[PDB]
Each structure stands twice: as C-alpha cells, then as structure tokens.
Amino acid sequence: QVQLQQPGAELVKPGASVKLSCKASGYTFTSDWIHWVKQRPGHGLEWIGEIIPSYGRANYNEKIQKKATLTADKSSSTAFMQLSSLTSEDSAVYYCARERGDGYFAVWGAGTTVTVSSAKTTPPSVYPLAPGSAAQTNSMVTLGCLVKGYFPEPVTVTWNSGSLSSGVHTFPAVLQSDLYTLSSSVTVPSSSWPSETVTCNVAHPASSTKVDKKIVPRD
Amino acid sequence: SALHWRAAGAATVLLVIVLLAGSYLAVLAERGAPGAQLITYPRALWWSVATATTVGYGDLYPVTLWGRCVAVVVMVAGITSFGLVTAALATWFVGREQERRGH
Amino acid sequence: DILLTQSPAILSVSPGERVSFSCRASQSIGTDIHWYQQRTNGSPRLLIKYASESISGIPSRFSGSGSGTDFTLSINSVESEDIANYYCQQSNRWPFTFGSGTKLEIKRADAAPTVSIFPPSSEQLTSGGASVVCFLNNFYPKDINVKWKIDGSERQNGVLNSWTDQDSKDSTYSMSSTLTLTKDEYERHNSYTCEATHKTSTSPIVKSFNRN
Ligand SMILES: CCCCCCCCCO
Ligand SMILES: [K+]
Ligand SMILES: [K+]
Ligand SMILES: [K+]
Ligand SMILES: [K+]
Ligand SMILES: [K+]
Ligand SMILES: [K+]
Ligand SMILES: [K+]
DSSP: OOOEEOOSEEEEOTTOEEEEEEEEOSSOOTTOEEEEEEEOTTSOOEEEEEEETTTTEEEEOSSSOOOOOEEEETTTTEEEEEEESOOGGGOEEEEEEEEOSSSSOOEEOOOEEEEEOSSOOBOOEEEEEOOOTTOOOOSEEEEEEEEEEEBSSOOEEEETTTTBOSSEEEOOOOOSSSOEEEEEEEEEETTHHHHSOOBEEEEEGGGTEEEOOBOOOOO | OOHHHHHHHHHHHHHHHHHHHHHHHHHHHHTTSTTOOOOSHHHHHHHHHHHHTTOOOTTOSOOSHHHHHHHHHHHHHHHHHHHHHHHHHHHHHHHHHHHHTTO | OOOEEOOOSEEEEOTTOOEEEEEEESSOOTTOEEEEEEOTTSOOEEEEETTTEEOTTSOTTEEEEEETTEEEEEESSOOGGGOSEEEEEEOSSSSOEEOOOEEEEEOOOOBOOEEEEEOOOHHHHTTTEEEEEEEEEEEBSSOEEEEEEETTEEEOTTEEOOBOOOOTTTSOEEEEEEEEEEHHHHHTOSEEEEEEEETTEEEEEEEEEEOO
8 A cells, every 4th residue: 555645736936935744654664764856847856855753863965955854753654844945946746755774765655746836726627528429430439528727737637536547648738827738538449438427537636626527428 | 600601691692782773873873974885774784793893894984973983882892792702711711620620 | 976877868669679778877886776667647666676686566577787887777578568767776875866867768660640629618618718629649650740720721829739758558649739719719610620640641630520
C-alpha cells in the first residue's frame, strides 16, 4: 500500500509561503530519512534537502538558494517543508521520498504540484464528448470528455473510476488567460457502448473537487 | 568466573554497542558536510570496525568535528577493549604458572 | 559535488532491441549509484540500486553495470512500458545528486491516425461557450498537421493543439485540436471540418459535422 502521502497541489501567491506535508506508513525506523526533490516541468530531478524525524536535524542543498525549512512530527509520522518568499521559479512538483540511510530512495510520494501565481483557484468545467449522429463506426468507438476553465494544475482523469484504462489518452493542459484546459479520450469496443455505461471522473485538488460525467449519445 | 574474565566479556559487549551507536552517530554528524563519505549506515559501520581496530583506509574518515569526536570514542573503546582482553589473558597465564610452581 | 553526466539525453531504439543508458561521475564513486525510472506524469521508481543489485518487482529485462565513474543501465527486448525518463543518483559523497536524465524513445511501424470530431456539448453551449474538439489518436511518426474549415473555408483563430509524449502502451503519439467559438459564432455556421494530414497518406483524413 501507498507509503508516502502528499497533497496533490498547493497554490501560493508570489511573495507568500507554504508548508507541504508528507505522512508515512508501513515500516518506519528511527534511522529513516525523508528527502525532498524539486522537479520543474520538463526538467530533471533536484535534491532540496533531507531530515531525520526521530531527531529533527535537517540538511539542505547549498548550491541553490534556501527557500525551504524542514521539520517533522514524530506522532503522526508526518514531515513538513516550509517554502517561503516564492517566485515563479519556485513553481514545480515537489516529491518527498524515503531513504533507509543506505543511499537510495526506495519509495516516493505522488508529489505536490505547487503553482506561484496571483490568480485564484477555479474548479474545472467538464463537458462530455460523444460522436455525431452522422459519424458511422466500426469495431471500436471513441469517446472522451473535456475538462476546461480551471486553475491551477493538475487534474486527474479516470474512466469508470479507474476500472477502465486500455485505450485512454489525457492530453497535456494548455494555458490561455489564467486558465487551463485539456481533454481525455477513451476507446471501447463499439458493442459495449452504451449498453455498458462509460464515465469520466475528474479531480482537481487545488479546489478539492471531483466531478463525474457519464458519456451518452446525442439525443 | 573471575572478574577479569567478566571485564573482558563486558568490554566486548560494550565495544559492539559503541560500534553501532558510532556508525549511527557518524552519519548524523557527517551528513551536511560537503564531500563527506561517512554518510550511509553500512559504510560507517565498516569504517567503525576499522577505526576500533585502529586501521585507516584512505580518506574514509570523518570530516566534521563531531564526526571526529565520535571517531575518538570508537578508537579508545576499541583499544581499551583489546588491551583489556590482553590483560585478562595475562591474569590467566600468571595464575596457571603460580599453580605449575605449586606456589 | 559529484557531477553525474547522462549522455545522450535521448535514445531511439527499435522494439525488442537491447538498450544501454550511461551515467558518468565527475570522480570515482565505487558502485554507489542507483537508477530510477519515471514515466510521464508518474513519480520516480527505483529500478536498480548500487549499480547492479536488482530490486523486487522489476522485470528481469533491467540490469546494471559499472563501477568507478562509468555506469550502464540496460534493458533487453525493450517495449512500450519502458518508454520514460531515466535517472541515476549517487550516494558516495554528500550531497546526493542526480544525472540530467535520458529519455527512451521506441521506433515502431508507421500508423495512420484514428480521427474523431466532436460537436460542442449541450451543457457547454448552455453557459455561453462552444468548443469543437477533434482527436488524432495513435498515429506515428509524431509529425502531423491538422486543419480546421468552417463552411468550406479554412479557419485558425481559436484553435489550440496539444500533443502527448510517445505512448507507453503501443509507442504511438496522439494529438488534441480544440477550436473554440462563442455560442453566437457557433450558432451562425453550418458545418465544421477537422483535417488530419499525415505521412501515411497523401490524402488527408477528414471528419466533419453540421450543426443541423
Ligand atoms: C564523545 C563524543 C560524543 C558522541 C557523539 C555525538 C554526535 C552528535 C551528532 O552531531
Ligand atoms: K595499529
Ligand atoms: K593504518
Ligand atoms: K594502523
Ligand atoms: K592507512
Ligand atoms: K591510506
Ligand atoms: K597494540
Ligand atoms: K606469594
């Protein structure tokens, strides 16, 4: 089961600060270290710093400027990273991982997408996407749903709540006027539809909202 | 069982503790110091055995002040342990010879 | 700090082939290096530790070689699920660091795109919006051109495209073209066409629909 849990996202205003979390489970020792890694879209992995909960001592990367402060909480097995005075350069996915003290990150979290913007949270608008009554078909049918008008990223999109995977494309969002927009597409055998309902689930952590949307044919 | 045979034993137990605690403390003291090598538990434990037996290997040594202080405790515990075994073996031999002479 | 150099940044190999990523340290680090796999949108996954020790739950197609300053991450019979970014990381000296990474890219047989045009949803129009979406799925090579025509004439303004990195299921590519209009703008036009020009066909694959 999932060893490290981090908040899908966090929005912060340029100049402001933010404390990210990372709680654990499974095997945990007094010798374990929790690390933090920064990844800017399209870039590689960047070590930020480490901390050992059962003592509270932490070390940070000195080559880059120190926008962080690490702290932990023994009881709830939760580690925190205090990022302050953020600029756009601080926007990225921040992972936390666990190291048994032998040098390698055995288990990582899903990471927390952080966006430093003046703009404000905007839940996603989801509109179905079914073929046109004029378009024929063959052994397979292609449907999908449109997520749009939201801020910030990211957004998780599943089909039938994850039970449906084979044949799914979730295109990369695009920014145009402080708002994102993307479409995901599913492809089931023409038969199964719609005699076997198909739904697209959309979660948007920045606003704590997860909407559903069954995909049915046009009238 | 004689005292000396106990201190010998006791010392051996204590040495094993210092080695482990040492491997552990070394890493804590060392992570954070640029270029440090004593920074994973296993390595430090071998570094620990080496130091306790007074053996050096390159630059596989602590670079921080506390790292070194730890190094000192490990060396001393190791030299005190082995010299104590040495003393115990010397009491055993000095006692048997007293018997051999029916003294 | 130990510098990790992964070159080339991108590796193009054909399906089933063997592949080898290299990681070079700025100095000797014994075997204190570990590899990580990261697929698109996922988080890093530990593939190999200490240069050649196998992790549990990893296909036996993955192996590691090296020591000192030269290291190799190999994959036998490469496949779609292997398409990702590979990173090395060292634990010889403080601080730990990572290499710049290497992208795996598989070259498969050409595949014409499946296209689908979608008329704005009723729920959408109801709120003053109108988006004509179109999907070019599973094509290859990734180079593709999409065209929008409104009532016979070519259109552009309002169109926003999106591409996906090679797919980790079949090694194909897919694109999303979204031409947005206002209800009105939409309420006053008959048909909308989506044209996909692709290397596999001299003639473009077209899908259309009229608002009637
Ligand atoms: C006798 C030396 C003291 C024991 C080592 C303490 C290390 C503390 C960590 O910084
Ligand atoms: K000696
Ligand atoms: K020596
Ligand atoms: K010596
Ligand atoms: K020596
Ligand atoms: K030497
Ligand atoms: K001696
Ligand atoms: K006497």
